[PDB]
Short mmCIF file of C-alpha atoms and ligand atoms in Angstrom, two decimals:
data_model
loop_
_atom_site.label_atom_id
_atom_site.label_comp_id
_atom_site.label_asym_id
_atom_site.label_seq_id
_atom_site.Cartn_x
_atom_site.Cartn_y
_atom_site.Cartn_z
CA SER L 1 113.61 27.52 75.40
CA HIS L 2 114.11 25.09 72.52
CA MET L 3 117.25 23.47 72.29
CA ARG L 4 118.04 20.42 69.86
CA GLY L 5 121.10 18.70 69.01
CA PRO L 6 124.52 18.80 69.98
CA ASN L 7 126.40 21.93 71.59
CA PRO L 8 127.54 23.50 68.25
CA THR L 9 131.43 24.05 67.01
CA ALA L 10 132.71 26.25 64.47
CA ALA L 11 133.59 22.77 62.83
CA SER L 12 130.08 21.44 62.92
CA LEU L 13 128.43 24.72 61.91
CA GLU L 14 131.16 25.04 58.93
CA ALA L 15 130.19 21.44 57.64
CA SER L 16 128.04 20.16 54.83
CA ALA L 17 125.29 18.96 57.11
CA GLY L 18 124.09 19.03 60.78
CA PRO L 19 122.93 16.34 62.66
CA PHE L 20 119.80 15.48 61.39
CA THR L 21 118.87 13.15 58.36
CA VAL L 22 116.83 15.33 55.71
CA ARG L 23 114.41 14.38 53.20
CA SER L 24 112.42 16.50 50.66
CA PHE L 25 108.91 16.46 48.74
CA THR L 26 107.38 18.77 46.22
CA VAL L 27 104.19 20.43 47.46
CA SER L 28 101.17 18.83 45.37
CA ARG L 29 98.72 21.80 45.16
CA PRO L 30 100.87 24.92 46.09
CA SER L 31 98.18 27.42 47.99
CA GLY L 32 98.87 30.92 46.74
CA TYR L 33 102.80 30.73 45.30
CA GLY L 34 103.89 28.77 42.39
CA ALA L 35 105.71 25.80 43.68
CA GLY L 36 107.66 24.44 46.31
CA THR L 37 109.89 22.11 47.89
CA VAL L 38 109.90 21.18 51.59
CA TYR L 39 112.98 19.86 53.20
CA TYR L 40 112.69 18.19 56.74
CA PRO L 41 114.42 16.28 59.71
CA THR L 42 113.38 12.92 59.90
CA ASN L 43 115.14 12.39 63.21
CA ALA L 44 114.93 15.87 65.31
CA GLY L 45 113.38 14.31 68.36
CA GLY L 46 111.46 17.14 68.94
CA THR L 47 109.18 19.87 66.70
CA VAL L 48 111.27 22.29 64.94
CA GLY L 49 110.56 25.77 63.67
CA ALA L 50 109.95 26.44 59.89
CA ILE L 51 111.53 28.78 57.10
CA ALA L 52 110.41 29.95 53.85
CA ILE L 53 112.49 31.04 51.04
CA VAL L 54 111.83 33.10 47.87
CA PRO L 55 114.34 33.78 45.09
CA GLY L 56 115.03 36.93 43.10
CA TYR L 57 113.27 38.33 39.80
CA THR L 58 113.59 35.61 36.82
CA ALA L 59 114.77 33.08 39.25
CA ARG L 60 113.77 30.18 40.53
CA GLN L 61 114.27 27.25 43.63
CA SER L 62 117.66 26.32 42.09
CA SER L 63 118.89 29.84 43.22
CA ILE L 64 118.45 29.28 46.71
CA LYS L 65 117.88 25.46 47.24
CA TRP L 66 121.22 24.88 48.73
CA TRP L 67 119.82 26.10 52.08
CA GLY L 68 117.18 23.44 52.05
CA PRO L 69 119.53 20.47 53.20
CA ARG L 70 122.25 23.04 55.14
CA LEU L 71 119.09 24.35 57.56
CA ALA L 72 117.08 21.34 57.57
CA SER L 73 120.39 19.01 58.69
CA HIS L 74 120.62 21.43 61.97
CA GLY L 75 116.72 21.10 62.83
CA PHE L 76 114.43 23.16 60.65
CA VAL L 77 111.42 22.56 58.19
CA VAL L 78 112.52 24.58 54.96
CA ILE L 79 110.09 25.51 52.22
CA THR L 80 111.85 26.87 48.82
CA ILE L 81 109.57 28.24 46.67
CA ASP L 82 108.84 29.43 43.12
CA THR L 83 106.81 32.34 42.88
CA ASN L 84 103.57 32.65 40.86
CA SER L 85 105.58 34.65 37.84
CA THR L 86 109.12 34.89 37.97
CA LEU L 87 108.28 38.69 37.30
CA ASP L 88 106.78 39.19 40.73
CA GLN L 89 107.37 42.15 43.00
CA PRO L 90 108.85 42.23 46.58
CA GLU L 91 105.04 42.72 48.08
CA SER L 92 103.77 39.92 46.33
CA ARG L 93 107.08 37.95 47.21
CA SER L 94 106.42 38.86 50.69
CA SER L 95 102.68 37.52 50.41
CA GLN L 96 103.55 34.22 48.85
CA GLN L 97 106.28 33.61 51.41
CA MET L 98 103.76 33.99 54.10
CA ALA L 99 101.39 31.69 51.99
CA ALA L 100 104.14 28.83 51.99
CA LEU L 101 104.75 29.26 55.52
CA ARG L 102 100.63 28.98 56.10
CA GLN L 103 100.51 25.90 54.12
CA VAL L 104 103.44 24.12 56.05
CA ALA L 105 101.56 24.80 59.22
CA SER L 106 98.84 23.10 57.44
CA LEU L 107 100.68 20.19 56.45
CA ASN L 108 102.21 19.60 60.16
CA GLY L 109 98.23 19.26 60.94
CA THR L 110 97.32 16.70 58.06
CA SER L 111 98.22 13.48 59.02
CA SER L 112 98.68 12.07 55.27
CA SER L 113 102.04 14.65 55.48
CA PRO L 114 105.42 13.67 55.60
CA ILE L 115 106.15 16.57 58.11
CA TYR L 116 102.82 15.50 60.20
CA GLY L 117 103.44 16.71 63.99
CA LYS L 118 107.23 17.85 62.94
CA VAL L 119 106.71 21.67 63.19
CA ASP L 120 106.29 24.13 65.82
CA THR L 121 103.87 26.68 64.03
CA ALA L 122 104.83 29.18 66.57
CA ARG L 123 108.63 29.18 65.37
CA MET L 124 108.87 30.66 62.16
CA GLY L 125 111.73 32.77 59.83
CA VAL L 126 112.13 34.22 56.57
CA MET L 127 114.91 33.98 54.18
CA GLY L 128 115.31 35.28 50.27
CA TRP L 129 117.58 36.30 47.69
CA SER L 130 117.03 40.05 46.44
CA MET L 131 113.49 41.01 45.89
CA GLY L 132 113.08 37.92 47.60
CA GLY L 133 115.12 39.27 50.46
CA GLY L 134 113.42 42.82 50.12
CA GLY L 135 110.12 40.55 50.32
CA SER L 136 111.60 38.71 53.92
CA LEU L 137 112.02 42.44 55.27
CA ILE L 138 108.31 43.21 54.08
CA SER L 139 107.19 39.81 55.81
CA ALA L 140 109.08 40.64 58.98
CA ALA L 141 107.79 44.41 59.23
CA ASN L 142 104.04 42.83 58.52
CA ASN L 143 104.40 40.23 60.83
CA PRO L 144 106.51 41.00 63.99
CA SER L 145 106.04 37.18 65.65
CA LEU L 146 108.10 35.79 63.02
CA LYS L 147 111.44 34.96 65.11
CA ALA L 148 114.31 35.85 62.13
CA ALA L 149 114.87 36.88 59.10
CA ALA L 150 118.06 36.33 56.98
CA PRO L 151 117.76 37.92 53.62
CA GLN L 152 120.59 37.85 51.20
CA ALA L 153 121.86 40.92 48.78
CA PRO L 154 117.96 42.18 49.45
CA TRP L 155 116.64 44.82 47.20
CA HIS L 156 113.52 47.04 47.56
CA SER L 157 112.16 50.08 46.30
CA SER L 158 112.57 51.70 49.74
CA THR L 159 115.45 51.02 52.10
CA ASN L 160 113.37 52.20 55.14
CA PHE L 161 112.42 49.20 57.53
CA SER L 162 112.78 51.19 60.60
CA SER L 163 109.47 49.13 62.02
CA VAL L 164 111.02 45.91 61.97
CA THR L 165 111.83 44.37 65.31
CA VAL L 166 112.56 40.62 63.76
CA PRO L 167 116.35 39.96 64.07
CA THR L 168 117.44 40.17 60.62
CA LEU L 169 120.74 39.29 59.44
CA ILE L 170 121.95 40.73 56.34
CA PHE L 171 124.04 38.73 53.68
CA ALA L 172 125.69 41.38 51.24
CA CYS L 173 127.78 40.81 48.08
CA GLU L 174 130.34 43.52 47.92
CA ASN L 175 130.62 43.84 44.04
CA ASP L 176 126.90 43.18 43.44
CA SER L 177 125.96 45.44 40.49
CA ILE L 178 121.99 44.27 40.88
CA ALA L 179 121.46 45.67 44.48
CA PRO L 180 124.59 47.46 45.32
CA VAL L 181 125.76 47.13 48.93
CA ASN L 182 125.91 51.14 49.32
CA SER L 183 122.49 51.67 47.80
CA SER L 184 120.73 48.65 49.04
CA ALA L 185 121.82 46.31 51.70
CA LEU L 186 123.70 49.21 53.97
CA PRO L 187 120.75 51.50 53.84
CA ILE L 188 118.48 48.72 54.76
CA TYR L 189 120.51 47.42 57.64
CA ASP L 190 120.95 51.03 58.70
CA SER L 191 117.28 51.88 58.78
CA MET L 192 116.78 49.37 61.54
CA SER L 193 117.22 50.62 65.24
CA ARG L 194 114.94 48.48 66.87
CA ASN L 195 116.06 45.00 66.43
CA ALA L 196 119.12 42.47 66.95
CA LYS L 197 120.65 43.00 63.07
CA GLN L 198 123.73 41.87 61.61
CA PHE L 199 125.56 42.96 58.53
CA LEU L 200 128.05 40.29 56.60
CA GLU L 201 129.48 41.08 53.33
CA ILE L 202 131.34 38.94 51.08
CA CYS L 203 134.63 40.15 49.58
CA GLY L 204 134.53 40.41 45.56
CA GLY L 205 131.01 38.86 45.77
CA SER L 206 128.80 39.15 42.96
CA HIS L 207 125.23 39.22 43.20
CA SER L 208 124.57 35.73 43.30
CA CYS L 209 127.27 35.31 46.23
CA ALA L 210 125.00 33.57 48.61
CA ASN L 211 123.33 31.51 46.30
CA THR L 212 123.57 27.36 45.17
CA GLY L 213 126.94 26.68 44.14
CA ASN L 214 128.80 29.62 45.85
CA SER L 215 132.23 28.92 47.42
CA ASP L 216 131.69 30.68 50.60
CA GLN L 217 129.14 27.85 52.16
CA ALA L 218 131.37 26.95 54.97
CA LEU L 219 130.94 30.79 56.35
CA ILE L 220 127.60 31.94 54.83
CA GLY L 221 126.12 28.32 56.40
CA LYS L 222 127.59 28.76 59.47
CA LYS L 223 126.06 32.30 59.96
CA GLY L 224 122.57 31.62 58.54
CA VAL L 225 122.12 28.27 60.80
CA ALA L 226 123.76 30.20 63.99
CA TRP L 227 121.39 33.04 63.31
CA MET L 228 118.31 30.83 62.92
CA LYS L 229 119.09 28.20 65.99
CA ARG L 230 119.81 31.77 68.25
CA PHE L 231 116.32 33.62 67.34
CA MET L 232 113.94 30.71 66.46
CA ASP L 233 115.34 28.44 68.83
CA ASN L 234 116.36 30.91 71.47
CA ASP L 235 119.24 28.54 71.61
CA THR L 236 121.98 30.74 73.55
CA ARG L 237 124.42 28.07 72.85
CA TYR L 238 124.54 29.76 69.46
CA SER L 239 124.87 33.47 70.99
CA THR L 240 128.60 33.92 69.65
CA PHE L 241 128.41 31.91 66.84
CA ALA L 242 125.39 34.43 65.76
CA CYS L 243 126.40 37.59 67.19
CA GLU L 244 130.72 37.27 66.62
CA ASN L 245 132.53 38.70 64.08
CA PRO L 246 133.50 35.87 62.44
CA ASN L 247 137.13 36.84 61.64
CA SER L 248 137.23 35.73 58.01
CA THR L 249 139.42 37.05 55.06
CA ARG L 250 136.30 36.45 53.10
CA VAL L 251 134.26 39.36 55.03
CA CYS L 252 134.99 42.83 53.56
CA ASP L 253 132.56 44.32 56.16
CA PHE L 254 131.18 43.44 59.18
CA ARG L 255 128.24 45.07 61.40
CA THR L 256 126.00 44.14 64.16
CA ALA L 257 124.07 45.69 66.84
CA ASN L 258 121.72 44.70 69.80
CA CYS L 259 123.37 41.23 69.43
CA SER L 260 124.47 39.67 72.73
CA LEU L 261 127.73 37.30 72.63
MG1 MG S 1 115.79 40.68 41.98
#
């Protein structure tokens, strides 16, 4: 429905950057969250969807920052936030995530903003690490008009997300001792029976295995961008990339359902 950029390849999705040049700015007066950096394409040649990304407990934008330029360069507006407190819980993280999306939607209609007219505010996604990944799934449960979710090493006090109808990719980290796969990511994935979903576990990964500076950005970036293109943009050129077992020796557990190639 909303295809931008050239036909993808493994090589184009695994590279450092997509086709679009990326700029960023710090939000001046963050509305309902602590701080925010907005990454955006200067030359997408069409409006793009928006993605809000939340860190884990104690953590800040640095932890998840790499996703900003990576996603934006493929044709998205990305906001990475600091929460009002580093010690905010998942419900609060979800509220702040949606507040960041709301503010991006607002700045799209503000003529002084660098993202004036760049955003399709009907096409939105959510991402985050740990309690911020838990917050993303809460966002998805409460706001089913969201187009995609792709949390990493998610954690929540409940693993029951059976109501989620949003297409959800879960990144997991095999050797996570904070949000162990067996007791967090996997039961969350298994709870969801009404959506397109995927589970991708990185071999030997600590809890930070999908964070800034990780050594698997080729694969994790490929998958995050493909999921977002396929579901935020309804771009079926990405159906294989989004839905396929990537056949990587860095993946120690792969599962997917309701995800057509
Ligand atoms: Mg956490």
